[PDB]
Amino acid sequence: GGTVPRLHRPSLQHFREQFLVPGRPVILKGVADHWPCMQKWSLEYIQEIAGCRTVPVEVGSRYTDEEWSQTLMTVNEFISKYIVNEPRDVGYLAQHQLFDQIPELKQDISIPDYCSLGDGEEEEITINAWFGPQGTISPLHQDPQQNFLVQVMGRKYIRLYSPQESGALYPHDTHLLHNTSQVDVENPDLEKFPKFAKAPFLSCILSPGEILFIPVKYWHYVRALDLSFSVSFWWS
Ligand SMILES: CNC(=N)NCCC[C@H](N)C(=O)O
Ligand SMILES: [Zn+2]
């Protein structure tokens, strides 16, 4: 398919009518460009301010893997073990409300103005950290709210598939995993998942300073291309 459209600081109104109401993904430029975190977040800064804090870490290349597990460690431990010193295994600090834990970090980001278009309240917006090495994969899944994914460090390759295309995504039947596809997007078993081939999609390479809008229930897959650090805002 095609690329996600990029737009330089679209107005509330036009963001609302063109993307939010109809549920169309878009990359917003010029918005997160000047937030303090783009200039200062780096390994040394992360260690200095968060080094000693305990954090959940996912070990294993993909969360749908049989051998995937979850563990806890300090930030310094995570960086030395899964990022810096030739990691034996894949470690991802994922989906963690790090700003709740380290409130000094929260001044480096801002809640995007477009969040105010939803009929929910500011403080109920969930802000998650996503930090890991090159090569981390988040398998094809859907979320229950709107999402603003801001890229601070590195790049990410992302594939988006519409919620209307769900039939072709072969979601798990378990209930726990109903929001996760059974397909490995980048090397799909087309003998087992033949409908996946036809399903149209959008893709992009999200880069630092860019905000991707992922509409509620829109399926998304993410693979970090470099040492990456993203911030997601879930809102309604
Ligand atoms: C949480 N595991 C993560 N590495 N995969 C990407 C995110 C999937 C998560 N289930 C979500 O709601 O976005
Ligand atoms: Zn997600």
Numbering used by the authors: 181 to 416
From the paper:
To cross-confirm the authenticity, we also determined the complex structure of c-JMJD5 and monomethyl arginine, and to no surprise, the monomethyl arginine occupies the exact same position as that of dimethyl arginine, except missing a methyl group. The question here is whether c-JMJD5 or JMJD7 has different binding affinity depending on the methylation status of arginine. From the complex structure shown above, c-JMJD5 contains a binding pocket for methylarginine that is similar to those of Tudor domains. However, the hydrogen bond between NE atom of methylarginine and the sidechain of Ser318 could be critical for substrate discrimination.
